[PDB]
Amino acid sequence: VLRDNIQGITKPAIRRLARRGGVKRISGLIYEETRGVLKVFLENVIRDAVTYTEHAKRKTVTAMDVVYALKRQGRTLYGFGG
Protein backbone atom coordinates (compact mmCIF):
# COMPACT_ATOMS: atom_id res chain seq x y z
CA VAL A 1 0.00 0.00 0.00
CA LEU A 2 2.99 2.25 0.74
CA ARG A 3 6.62 1.92 -0.35
CA ASP A 4 9.88 3.91 -0.68
CA ASN A 5 8.49 6.46 1.77
CA ILE A 6 11.92 6.59 3.42
CA GLN A 7 12.91 8.76 0.46
CA GLY A 8 10.42 11.33 1.70
CA ILE A 9 13.05 12.30 4.27
CA THR A 10 14.83 14.53 1.80
CA LYS A 11 18.45 15.61 1.70
CA PRO A 12 17.71 19.28 2.63
CA ALA A 13 15.83 18.12 5.73
CA ILE A 14 18.84 16.10 6.86
CA ARG A 15 21.02 19.15 6.18
CA ARG A 16 18.76 21.27 8.40
CA LEU A 17 18.88 18.66 11.17
CA ALA A 18 22.68 18.63 10.94
CA ARG A 19 22.82 22.43 11.07
CA ARG A 20 20.78 22.53 14.28
CA GLY A 21 23.36 20.10 15.64
CA GLY A 22 26.26 22.38 14.74
CA VAL A 23 27.70 20.51 11.75
CA LYS A 24 29.60 22.73 9.31
CA ARG A 25 30.55 20.29 6.53
CA ILE A 26 28.76 17.10 5.48
CA SER A 27 29.94 14.16 3.40
CA GLY A 28 27.80 12.65 0.66
CA LEU A 29 27.19 9.29 2.31
CA ILE A 30 25.48 10.67 5.44
CA TYR A 31 21.99 10.57 3.97
CA GLU A 32 21.73 6.78 3.67
CA GLU A 33 23.12 6.30 7.19
CA THR A 34 20.62 8.80 8.57
CA ARG A 35 17.71 7.07 6.84
CA GLY A 36 18.74 3.69 8.23
CA VAL A 37 19.19 5.01 11.76
CA LEU A 38 15.84 6.79 11.71
CA LYS A 39 14.10 3.68 10.40
CA VAL A 40 15.51 1.52 13.21
CA PHE A 41 14.52 4.05 15.89
CA LEU A 42 11.00 4.34 14.50
CA GLU A 43 10.59 0.55 14.34
CA ASN A 44 11.47 0.11 18.01
CA VAL A 45 9.19 2.87 19.28
CA ILE A 46 6.27 1.91 17.05
CA ARG A 47 6.47 -1.75 18.07
CA ASP A 48 6.21 -0.78 21.73
CA ALA A 49 3.34 1.63 21.04
CA VAL A 50 1.34 -0.94 19.09
CA THR A 51 1.85 -3.50 21.87
CA TYR A 52 0.46 -0.99 24.38
CA THR A 53 -2.48 -0.21 22.10
CA GLU A 54 -3.37 -3.83 21.44
CA HIS A 55 -3.27 -4.67 25.14
CA ALA A 56 -6.14 -2.24 25.73
CA LYS A 57 -8.14 -3.87 22.90
CA ARG A 58 -8.29 -0.63 20.91
CA LYS A 59 -7.75 0.02 17.22
CA THR A 60 -6.40 3.60 17.20
CA VAL A 61 -2.96 4.43 18.55
CA THR A 62 -3.23 7.24 21.09
CA ALA A 63 -0.70 9.79 22.28
CA MET A 64 -0.40 8.10 25.67
CA ASP A 65 0.77 4.88 24.01
CA VAL A 66 3.63 6.78 22.37
CA VAL A 67 4.40 8.56 25.64
CA TYR A 68 4.58 5.27 27.56
CA ALA A 69 6.67 3.62 24.84
CA LEU A 70 9.17 6.47 24.93
CA LYS A 71 9.27 6.50 28.73
CA ARG A 72 9.99 2.77 28.81
CA GLN A 73 13.18 3.15 26.77
CA GLY A 74 14.68 6.15 28.57
CA ARG A 75 13.44 8.85 26.18
CA THR A 76 11.01 10.64 28.50
CA LEU A 77 8.99 13.31 26.69
CA TYR A 78 7.14 16.28 28.19
CA GLY A 79 4.22 18.15 26.69
CA PHE A 80 1.71 15.55 25.48
CA GLY A 81 0.26 14.50 28.81
CA GLY A 82 1.62 12.00 31.27
Binding site: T76, Y78, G79, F80, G81, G82
Partner: protein
Protein backbone atom coordinates in the same frame (compact mmCIF):
# COMPACT_ATOMS: atom_id res chain seq x y z
CA UNK B 1 -13.44 15.55 35.54
CA UNK B 2 -9.67 15.49 35.06
CA UNK B 3 -7.40 17.00 37.71
CA UNK B 4 -4.01 18.66 37.41
CA UNK B 5 -1.54 20.88 39.29
CA UNK B 6 -2.31 23.99 37.24
CA UNK B 7 -3.68 26.35 39.88
CA UNK B 8 -0.90 25.57 42.37
CA UNK B 9 1.76 26.23 39.74
CA UNK B 10 0.03 29.52 38.93
CA UNK B 11 -0.02 30.48 42.61
CA UNK B 12 3.71 29.82 42.94
CA UNK B 13 4.38 31.80 39.76
CA UNK B 14 2.49 34.78 41.16
CA UNK B 15 4.59 34.34 44.29
CA UNK B 16 7.97 34.59 42.57
CA UNK B 17 7.13 36.79 39.53
CA UNK B 18 4.10 38.96 40.35
CA UNK B 19 3.67 40.26 36.77
CA UNK B 20 4.35 37.26 34.54
CA UNK B 21 1.92 34.92 32.80
CA UNK B 22 2.28 31.46 31.30
CA UNK B 23 0.99 29.79 28.16
CA UNK B 24 -0.88 26.50 28.11
CA UNK B 25 1.92 24.42 26.57
CA UNK B 26 4.32 25.47 29.32
CA UNK B 27 1.67 24.61 31.91
CA UNK B 28 1.45 21.12 30.41
CA UNK B 29 5.24 20.83 30.63
CA UNK B 30 5.15 21.86 34.29
CA UNK B 31 2.38 19.38 35.08
CA UNK B 32 4.39 16.56 33.50
CA UNK B 33 7.47 17.58 35.50
CA UNK B 34 5.57 17.50 38.80
CA UNK B 35 4.11 14.07 38.05
CA UNK B 36 7.52 12.68 37.04
CA UNK B 37 9.22 13.84 40.23
CA UNK B 38 6.34 12.54 42.36
CA UNK B 39 6.63 9.07 40.85
CA UNK B 40 10.41 9.01 41.25
CA UNK B 41 10.45 10.01 44.92
CA UNK B 42 7.53 7.79 45.92
CA UNK B 43 9.03 4.75 44.21
CA UNK B 44 12.40 5.23 45.88
CA UNK B 45 10.72 5.60 49.27
CA UNK B 46 8.77 2.39 48.65
CA UNK B 47 12.01 0.55 47.88
CA UNK B 48 13.61 1.88 51.07
CA UNK B 49 10.65 0.72 53.14
CA UNK B 50 10.72 -2.75 51.58
CA UNK B 51 14.47 -3.14 52.15
CA UNK B 52 14.18 -2.81 55.93
CA UNK B 53 11.01 -4.94 56.27
CA UNK B 54 8.71 -2.10 57.31
CA UNK B 55 5.08 -1.49 56.36
CA UNK B 56 4.83 2.31 56.68
CA UNK B 57 6.17 5.23 54.66
CA UNK B 58 7.13 8.05 57.02
CA UNK B 59 8.84 11.40 56.57
CA UNK B 60 12.19 9.74 57.26
CA UNK B 61 11.88 7.54 54.16
CA UNK B 62 10.94 10.60 52.11
CA UNK B 63 13.98 12.46 53.45
CA UNK B 64 16.32 9.61 52.54
CA UNK B 65 14.76 9.23 49.08
CA UNK B 66 15.21 12.96 48.49
CA UNK B 67 18.86 12.69 49.49
CA UNK B 68 19.29 9.76 47.10
CA UNK B 69 17.62 11.39 44.08
CA UNK B 70 18.37 15.12 44.03
CA UNK B 71 21.95 16.28 43.32
CA UNK B 72 24.13 18.72 45.20
CA UNK B 73 22.66 21.88 46.68
CA UNK B 74 19.12 20.95 45.64
CA UNK B 75 19.08 18.12 48.19
CA UNK B 76 20.19 20.44 50.99
CA UNK B 77 17.66 23.18 50.25
CA UNK B 78 14.82 20.70 49.72
CA UNK B 79 15.63 18.98 53.02
CA UNK B 80 15.52 22.34 54.81
CA UNK B 81 12.19 23.29 53.22
CA UNK B 82 10.55 19.98 54.03
CA UNK B 83 11.79 19.95 57.62
CA UNK B 84 10.44 23.47 58.14
CA UNK B 85 7.06 22.43 56.74
CA UNK B 86 6.82 19.33 58.94
CA UNK B 87 7.72 21.14 62.16
CA UNK B 88 5.29 23.97 61.37
CA UNK B 89 2.55 21.43 60.66
CA UNK B 90 3.10 19.59 63.94
CA UNK B 91 3.18 22.92 65.79
CA UNK B 92 -0.45 23.66 64.85
CA UNK B 93 -2.75 20.85 66.04
Amino acid sequence: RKESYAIYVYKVLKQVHPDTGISSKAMSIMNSFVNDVFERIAGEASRLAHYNKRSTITSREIQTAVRLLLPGELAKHAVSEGTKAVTKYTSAK
